[PDB]
Enzyme design. Structure first.
Site, short mmCIF file in Angstrom:
data_model
loop_
_atom_site.label_atom_id
_atom_site.label_comp_id
_atom_site.label_asym_id
_atom_site.label_seq_id
_atom_site.Cartn_x
_atom_site.Cartn_y
_atom_site.Cartn_z
N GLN B 15 0.83 -1.20 0.00
CA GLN B 15 0.00 0.00 0.00
C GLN B 15 0.86 1.26 0.00
O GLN B 15 0.52 2.25 -0.65
CB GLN B 15 -0.94 -0.01 1.20
CG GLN B 15 -1.93 -1.17 1.17
CD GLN B 15 -3.10 -0.98 2.12
OE1 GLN B 15 -4.26 -1.08 1.71
NE2 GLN B 15 -2.80 -0.72 3.39
N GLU B 71 -1.44 -13.16 0.67
CA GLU B 71 -2.86 -13.23 0.37
C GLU B 71 -3.18 -12.14 -0.65
O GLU B 71 -2.50 -11.11 -0.68
CB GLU B 71 -3.74 -13.07 1.62
CG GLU B 71 -3.58 -11.73 2.34
CD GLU B 71 -4.62 -10.70 1.93
OE1 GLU B 71 -5.60 -11.06 1.25
OE2 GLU B 71 -4.45 -9.52 2.31
N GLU B 183 3.10 -8.01 17.51
CA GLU B 183 3.98 -7.26 16.62
C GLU B 183 5.34 -6.97 17.25
O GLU B 183 6.34 -7.00 16.52
CB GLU B 183 3.29 -5.97 16.18
CG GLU B 183 2.09 -6.23 15.28
CD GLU B 183 1.61 -5.00 14.55
OE1 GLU B 183 2.05 -3.89 14.92
OE2 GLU B 183 0.79 -5.14 13.62
N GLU B 254 26.22 5.16 -2.02
CA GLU B 254 26.53 6.43 -1.37
C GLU B 254 25.67 6.67 -0.13
O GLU B 254 26.06 7.45 0.74
CB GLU B 254 26.33 7.57 -2.37
CG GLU B 254 26.87 8.91 -1.91
CD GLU B 254 26.59 10.02 -2.91
OE1 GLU B 254 26.10 9.71 -4.02
OE2 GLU B 254 26.84 11.20 -2.59
N1 LIG Z 1 1.85 3.10 7.43
C1 LIG Z 1 1.15 2.00 7.17
N2 LIG Z 1 1.25 0.91 8.00
C2 LIG Z 1 0.54 -0.22 7.74
C3 LIG Z 1 -0.28 -0.29 6.62
N3 LIG Z 1 -0.86 -1.51 6.61
C4 LIG Z 1 -0.42 -2.21 7.67
N4 LIG Z 1 0.43 -1.42 8.39
C5 LIG Z 1 1.15 -1.81 9.61
O1 LIG Z 1 1.48 -3.18 9.46
C6 LIG Z 1 1.18 -3.90 10.63
C7 LIG Z 1 0.28 -5.06 10.25
O2 LIG Z 1 1.01 -5.94 9.43
P1 LIG Z 1 0.86 -6.00 7.82
O3 LIG Z 1 2.09 -5.44 7.14
O4 LIG Z 1 -0.39 -5.29 7.36
O5 LIG Z 1 0.68 -7.58 7.56
P2 LIG Z 1 1.35 -8.34 6.31
O6 LIG Z 1 2.68 -7.74 5.94
O7 LIG Z 1 0.38 -8.37 5.15
O8 LIG Z 1 1.58 -9.83 6.86
P3 LIG Z 1 0.35 -10.78 7.28
O9 LIG Z 1 0.37 -10.99 8.77
O10 LIG Z 1 0.56 -12.10 6.57
O11 LIG Z 1 -0.97 -10.18 6.85
C8 LIG Z 1 0.52 -2.97 11.61
O12 LIG Z 1 1.41 -2.73 12.68
C9 LIG Z 1 0.27 -1.69 10.85
O13 LIG Z 1 0.62 -0.59 11.66
C10 LIG Z 1 -0.38 0.81 5.77
O14 LIG Z 1 -1.10 0.76 4.78
N5 LIG Z 1 0.34 1.95 6.05
MG LIG Z 2 -1.59 -9.09 5.35
#
Ligand SMILES: Nc1nc2c(ncn2[C@@H]2O[C@H](COP(=O)(O)OP(=O)(O)OP(=O)(O)O)[C@@H](O)[C@H]2O)c(=O)[nH]1
Ligand SMILES: [Mg+2]
Ligand SMILES: COc1cc(OC)c(Cl)c(-n2c(-c3ccccc3)cc(=O)c(C)c2-c2ccc(F)cc2)c1
Ligand SMILES: Nc1ncnc2c1ncn2[C@@H]1O[C@H](COP(=O)(O)OP(=O)(O)CP(=O)(O)O)[C@@H](O)[C@H]1O
Ligand SMILES: COc1cc2c(c(OC)c1OC)-c1ccc(OC)c(=O)cc1[C@@H](NC(C)=O)CC2
Ligand SMILES: Nc1nc2c(ncn2[C@@H]2O[C@H](COP(=O)(O)OP(=O)(O)O)[C@@H](O)[C@H]2O)c(=O)[nH]1
Ligand SMILES: [Ca+2]
Ligand SMILES: [Ca+2]
Ligand SMILES: [Ca+2]
Ligand SMILES: [Ca+2]
Ligand SMILES: [Mg+2]
Lengths: 418, 438, 54, 351
Positions: B15, B71, B183, B254
């Site tokens: 995203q 996914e 997390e 760099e």
């Molecule tokens: N800045 C920002 N942080 C995000 C976003 N989506 C998820 N996060 C962060 O990512 C964490 C959740 O993990 P994800 O990266 O969404 O999960 P994933 O990488 O798809 O891995 P899975 O557990 O398999 O779903 C949370 O701590 C959120 O704060 C986003 O769109 N922007």
């Molecule tokens: Mg995910």
């Protein structure tokens, strides 16, 4: 494409499950015939989770109806949403279980269990990516308890890597209509402790008190109680059925709600200004399980709010409840209260909130059943009905030991410190 | 011309990846269909903007990017988004079921099943490169995919492209922005496994992004769109040197030679200014000295910490827009006297500056206001270790009681890896303390 | 406090300002770790099915 | 209501205001490790500053300023004064001092000073002290540089050599030494609040210029006085003279007042020190706020010039004054950030 296979066994399981399919069918705007007649496309974005798409754009639940007594099948089939279900998914016997756990688990249910798994294989193989199973059943009877846990044990053999959820109606402290329910409940709990990832504890005495003391129904019936349970089941599965800021499945819920594999027995709640919902939602009077949260500490909590409502207002109110009564939350699981919001409210409601708590106070329930179990087992009261189906006393002693071990585990983390 | 490949892992990386490639197209005039009228060299070229884009004979400018997730929900939107035409479908890899916030599930269980396919698609883009520099990896610390699979990929990239450089853009978890109780576990595990394979990593704390959005943009409840659009501005300013002509930070190598004298201490703090609401009526234009001073206000940093109580080992200033070297030098002189800025005795107290005359770009309908001059400061200060301590403390509380450990063990990990990685972070925290504290 | 290393182009310019002077595992090693994790999962699943068989 | 935590269990000052906050009924005490607190009464060493101001929906306050150690350490203070233009190495209200490392060291600098005073036959009495010294021990006075350095080598921690005030103002009756303790509160807005009530901490042994061996007449720590002082408490209760009496003594004995002769210099030193470090420790723009109570120690010479000797970031109050001062901390430093439901004792030192 994370499909869930629903199974309901016994009277309680089928009566509760049947009302559940009525509720979400309205939420997804599906009529008894199985055709969609709703307003929003958000009703369909994730519909394949609980429904199969059939020819003619008819929607058929991924539901499997089980019992050893055909009577409850006919009630379901003639109910408001009776003709929604797949005819072949009615798997029933003729003998019944007689409130006997052994009959449901070893003899009468063992005869019918394979036929139920065959229907599971149909549904599961027709899934893009099978996510898990959910079971609705009572623990005090013989079919939903005895055969229900047998089905769970068999499913885990075929699908060991899938999630198993259950909505289990537990024996209530004072209201009972089954003399042998302590035996049936203790034998079932020892199965649930091993072969389920999440178990929602439901207590009929609490549901009856809500219907009578709160909702002001002078003559509550199982229909009224089932409506409350179905409303909670919809609220729990809101994130699995609708899109939003949260993209999570059953496995994520289990990963974050269960810090220890055996302690996966949840305390559901439901409510009913935004501040007043969060006040209700944490109240003992709104808990679906017969255990006082104030008699323990929450390991983890999940709150789901539905309906157009100020997000910031909910966040502030939730955060206030955590900080205000922080002595009822474990200090060694940082940020153990998570909240999600969905824009779609339920029927006839503008705002609603569903509560899911993994509280150590739930040991009170397992204490009760253990003491009731021991009083009967010391004198081998009613035992001949179970040994007559081929059970041995040692299997009763094991279940007593395990549930006491489970009670011992809960007390451990209720006093743990950082 | 040396190329740079971008790899986005998980929900956050994907995203954020879109917001970045959305902005890149606007900054370069590339249309959603991939055809940019501004390009005179069709079907190729040695332009600086080709470092991030490849060209086809049809005129389409194809990003040198790969999106990967376990996914398909997030990447499906890419395939059907406003910029769907921009990437060939092969660049978008999706699994069936995710890592379920489990570092082990993304690293061991599912990582082994998809690593070979991902590396093949990366190698397809590398074959279209004449002088590939390295990789820019966008991912979250918290997600099971973002933490688990990323650490696996970084290990394999160090094998298949040993000589090449790797930069990280990591989303640090924040309770305010949709986190998970586990997390802290995932963030520690992926840092330990990725530390030796990452030359320079830019952490972004969702707490800081959240507060900046809610305070400077007057957004009561920031969404992922609000945060990602702001995050893309900082990323774009950090990567502008690679996509435009210049003599500063022109090569991925760099980046750490200018920001990292110590291999393990490769987490530069990013500060950005000005962040102005478009809803602001007629926001008075700020000055070079004003925005440069804002680079030392903790409220503008990507990680809320206090550099006054650490030491600097390197500092860079990246201006976009109407900025003359005289004003920058004047601003630095004045604020050395006012602010507390202590360098390590074995480094010089200096600032590497860069100016790109193109003013910052803003997405149409976005919340950021079109400003004329903006600056992003990159400073390697020991104060960023405050973030590790916070994360490490949360790790300690749970791991003392082994809460949730069974989920990781069930996927094939040993409890030893929990303590091994925590030990590594204890060393990293101590490394920061020796450098930045007497 | 001098300006050094100034470079200019039509896109921009860069320089430095000194206020003060001063005073990996191989592939097979990776897969063995991934294989050791797979064996652990398989042994765990074997014990489950063994207990379920009993 | 609000919540707070206590992490300095041996803190006399903050043990009492922990009870004050509870007495209000609008506060509650969580235990050390519960992170959902509005206030922290943190530990003296290695307070986890990096973990504050990150809990969502909780304004957080702490009873310590990150970085104030630079002022409350004997080694840091000397370096802070000599290297800060605001104070400078030629600072007049701070005795000539040099930091000495046993076994960034100024041994030869102090050696150039003693020899300079040897040519002119000027006073050459110096005192060596360090933050390691505790319970009134680890400090030796001598007019022989050789003796001082030798004593500092037996000790391990960093040491500092300070020009000994050979000519202290002596109280009568007694012909005795003393030091002045001022309590200063700095709130989250960085207002500098000087407690109206100070205390003179008196030696009960006439100041003996001859021999410095008897350190009971030269060291005025209440701690040591009770240990090995015969005349303890002869004049004032517990060798604690207060401002009302000392002001009367200055009027009766020297036709002056405490405000003009001494307190005016005290306020100037407090501001200069605290304003010197404001840019480094101010929390006006931080995710968490800070306050802290300091204890400034002063020496008055016979010419009624005020000197600064030490600064305490974890000071102890006087038994008679705990009730009033601790109550002030709540009103000014805590209730300001966390208002409760619906005359001043401090002297505000202006910016
Ligand atoms: N800045 C920002 N942080 C995000 C976003 N989506 C998820 N996060 C962060 O990512 C964490 C959740 O993990 P994800 O990266 O969404 O999960 P994933 O990488 O798809 O891995 P899975 O557990 O398999 O779903 C949370 O701590 C959120 O704060 C986003 O769109 N922007
Ligand atoms: Mg995910
Ligand atoms: C669980 O054991 C029960 C014991 C009992 O009487 C001792 C009753 Cl009446 C019920 N019961 C029955 C019913 C059951 C079996 C035979 C006849 C009637 C039907 C019905 O609609 C509702 C709401 C209840 C009910 C539930 C929970 C309560 F707290 C109070 C009443 C259940
Ligand atoms: N330069 C000087 N000239 C004369 N006397 C001095 C002096 N420096 C210190 N003293 C005496 O030594 C005593 C204690 O000195 P110092 O302040 O180093 O000890 P300390 O730090 O343990 C006091 P506290 O515990 O309140 O911080 C004082 O009471 C003072 O009388
Ligand atoms: C069914 O879909 C759900 C899935 C999950 C959660 C949840 O409750 C809000 C759900 O709705 C019931 C969930 C709950 C547990 C946690 O809090 C302790 C957590 O950190 C983790 C959360 C969810 N994460 C977030 C940021 O909401 C992921 C798991
Ligand atoms: N909520 C609800 N609970 C029920 C219903 N029927 C039975 N129960 C519960 O289940 C127990 C009886 O078990 P039963 O449902 O007959 O189990 P079965 O033998 O498997 O069909 C009682 O103690 C009730 O608490 C029902 O319609 N609704
Ligand atoms: Ca039969
Ligand atoms: Ca068969
Ligand atoms: Ca070109
Ligand atoms: Ca490398
Ligand atoms: Mg001291």
């Amino acid at each position: 494409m994370r499909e869930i296979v629903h199974i309901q066994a016994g009277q309680c399981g089928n009566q509760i499950g049947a009302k559940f399919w009525e509720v979400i069918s309205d939420e997804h705007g599906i009529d008894p015939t199985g055709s969609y007649h709703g307003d929003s496309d958000l009703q369909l974005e994730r519909i394949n989770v609980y429904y199969n798409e059939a020819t003619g754009n008819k929607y058929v639940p991924r539901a499997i109806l089980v019992d050893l007594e055909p009577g409850t099948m006919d009630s379901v089939r003639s109910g408001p949403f009776g003709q929604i279900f797949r005819p072949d998914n009615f798997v029933f016997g003729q003998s019944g279980a007689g409130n006997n756990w052994a009959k449901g688990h070893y003899t009468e249910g063992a005869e019918l269990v394979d036929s139920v798994l065959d229907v599971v294989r149909k549904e599961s193989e027709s899934c893009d990516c099978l996510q898990g199973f959910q079971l609705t059943h009572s623990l005090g009877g013989g079919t939903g308890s005895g055969m229900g846990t047998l089905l769970i044990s068999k499913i885990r053999e075929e699908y060991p890597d899938r999630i198993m959820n259950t909505f289990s109606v537990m024996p209530s402290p004072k209201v009972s209509d089954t003399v042998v329910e302590p035996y049936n409940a203790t034998l079932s709990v020892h199965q649930l402790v091993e072969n389920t990832d999440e178990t929602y504890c439901i207590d009929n005495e609490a549901l009856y008190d809500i219907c009578f003391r709160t909702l002001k129904l002078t003559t509550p019936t199982y229909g009224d109680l089932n409506h409350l349970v179905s409303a909670t089941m919809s609220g729990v599965t809101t994130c699995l059925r609708f899109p939003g800021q949260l993209n999570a499945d059953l496995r994520k819920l289990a990963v974050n709600m269960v810090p220890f594999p055996r302690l996966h027995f949840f305390m559901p709640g439901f409510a009913p200004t935004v501040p007043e919902l969060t006040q209700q939602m944490f109240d003992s009077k709104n808990m679906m399980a017969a255990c006082d949260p104030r008699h323990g500490r929450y390991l983890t909590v999940a709150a789901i709010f539905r309906g157009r409502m100020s997000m910031k207002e909910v966040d502030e109110q939730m955060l206030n409840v955590q900080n205000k009564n922080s002595s009822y939350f474990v200090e060694w699981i940082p940020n153990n209260v998570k909240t999600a919001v969905c824009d779609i409210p339920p029927r006839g409601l503008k705002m609603s909130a569903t509560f899911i708590g993994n509280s150590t106070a739930i040991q009170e329930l397992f204490k009760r059943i253990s003491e009731q179990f021991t009083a009967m087992f010391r004198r081998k009261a009613f035992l001949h009905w179970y040994t007559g189906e081929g059970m041995d006393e040692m299997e009763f002693t094991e279940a007593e030991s395990n549930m006491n071990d489970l009670v011992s585990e809960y007390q451990q983390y209720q006093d743990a410190t950082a | 011309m040396r190329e740079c490949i971008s790899i986005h892992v998980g929900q956050a990386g994907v995203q954020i990846g879109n917001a970045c490639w959305e902005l890149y197209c606007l900054e370069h005039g590339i249309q959603p269909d991939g055809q940019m009228p501004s390009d005179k060299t069709i079907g190729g070229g040695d332009d600086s903007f080709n470092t991030f884009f490849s060209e086809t004979g049809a005129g389409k400018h194809v990003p040198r990017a790969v999106f990967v997730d376990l996914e398909p929900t997030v990447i499906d939107e890419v395939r059907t988004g406003t910029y769907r035409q921009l990437f060939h479908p092969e660049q978008l890899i999706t699994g069936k079921e995710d890592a379920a916030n489990n570092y082990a599930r993304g690293h061991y269980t599912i990582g082994k099943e998809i690593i070979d396919l991902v590396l093949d698609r990366i190698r397809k883009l590398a074959d279209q490169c004449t002088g590939l520099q390295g990789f820019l990896v966008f991912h979250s610390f918290g997600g099971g995919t973002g933490s688990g699979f990323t650490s696996l990929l970084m290990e394999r990239l160090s094998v298949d492209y040993g000589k090449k450089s790797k930069l990280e853009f990591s989303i640090y978890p924040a309770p305010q922005v949709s986190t998970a109780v586990v997390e802290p576990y995932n963030s520690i595990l992926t840092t330990h496994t990725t530390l030796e394979h990452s030359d320079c990593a830019f952490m972004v704390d969702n707490e800081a992004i959240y507060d900046i959005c809610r305070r400077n943009l007057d957004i009561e409840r920031p969404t992922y769109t609000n945060l990602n659009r702001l995050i893309s501005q900082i990323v774009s300013s950090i990567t502008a040197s690679l996509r435009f002509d210049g003599a500063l930070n022109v090569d991925l190598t760099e980046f750490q030679t200018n920001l990292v004298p110590y291999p393990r201490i490769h987490f530069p703090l990013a500060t950005y200014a000005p962040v102005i609401s478009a809803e602001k009526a007629y926001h008075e234009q700020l000055s070079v000295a004003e925005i440069t001073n804002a680079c030392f206000e903790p409220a503008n940093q990507m990680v809320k910490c206090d550099p006054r109580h650490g030491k600097y080992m390197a500092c860079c200033l990246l201006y976009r827009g109407d900025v003359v070297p005289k004003d920058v030098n004047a601003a630095i002189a004045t604020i050395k006297t006012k602010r507390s800025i202590q360098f390590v005795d074995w480094c010089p107290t200096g600032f590497k500056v860069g100016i790109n005359y193109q003013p910052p770009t803003v997405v149409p309908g976005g919340d950021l206001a079109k400003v004329q001059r903006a600056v992003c400061m990159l400073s390697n200060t020991t104060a960023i270790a405050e973030a590790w301590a916070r994360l490490d403390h949360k790790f300690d509380l749970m791991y003392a009681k082994r809460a949730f450990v069974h989920w990781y063990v069930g996927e094939g990990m040993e409890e030893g890896e929990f303590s091994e990685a925590r030990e590594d972070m204890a060393a990293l925290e101590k490394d920061y303390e020796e450098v930045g504290v007497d | 406090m001098e300006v050094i290393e100034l470079n200019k182009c039509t896109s921009g310019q860069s320089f430095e300002v000194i206020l003060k002077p001063p005073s990996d595992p191989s592939l097979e090693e990776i897969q063995k770790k991934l294989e050791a994790a797979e064996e652990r999962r398989k042994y765990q699943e074997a014990e489950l099915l063994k207990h379920l068989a009993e | 209501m609000y919540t707070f935590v206590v992490r300095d269990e041996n803190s006399s000052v903050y043990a009492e205001v922990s009870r004050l906050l509870l007495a209000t009924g609008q506060w509650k005490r969580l235990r050390k490790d519960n992170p959902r607190f509005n206030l922290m009464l943190g530990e003296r060493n290695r307070l986890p500053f990096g973990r504050l101001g990150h809990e969502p929906g909780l304004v957080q306050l702490v009873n310590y300023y990150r970085g104030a150690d630079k002022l409350c350490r004997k080694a840091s203070l000397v370096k802070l004064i000599k290297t800060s233009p605001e104070l400078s190495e030629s600072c007049t209200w701070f005795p000539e001092s040099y930091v000495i490392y046993p076994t960034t060291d100024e041994r030869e600098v102090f050696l150039a000073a003693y020899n300079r005073r040897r040519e002119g036959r000027e006073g050459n009495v110096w005192i060596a002290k360090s933050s390691a010294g505790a319970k009134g021990e680890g400090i030796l006075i001598s007019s022989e540089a050789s003796e001082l350095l030798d004593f500092i080598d037996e000790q391990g921690q960093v040491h500092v050599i300070q020009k000994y005030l050979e000519k202290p103002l002596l109280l009568e009756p007694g012909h005795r030494k003393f030091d002045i303790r001022s309590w200063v509160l700095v709130d989250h807005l960085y207002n500098i609040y000087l407690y109206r009530e100070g205390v003179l901490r008196t030696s009960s042994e006439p100041y003996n210029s001859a021999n410095f061996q008897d350190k009971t007449c030269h060291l005025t720590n209440h701690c040591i006085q009770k240990e090995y002082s015969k005349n303890y408490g002869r004049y004032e209760e517990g060798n604690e003279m207060f401002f009302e009496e000392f002001n009367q003594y200055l009027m009766d004995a020297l036709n002056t007042t405490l405000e003009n002769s001494i307190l005016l210099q005290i306020k100037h030193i407090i501001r200069s020190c605290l304003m010197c470090i404001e840019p480094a420790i101010s929390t006006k723009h931080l995710h968490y706020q800070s306050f802290q109570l300091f204890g400034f120690d002063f020496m008055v010479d016979e010419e009624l010039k005020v000197w600064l000797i030490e600064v305490n970031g974890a000071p102890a109050c006087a038994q008679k004054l705990y009730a009033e001062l601790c109550q002030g901390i709540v009103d000014v430093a805590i209730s300001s950030v966390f208002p409760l439901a619906d005359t001043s004792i401090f002297i505000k030192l202006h910016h």
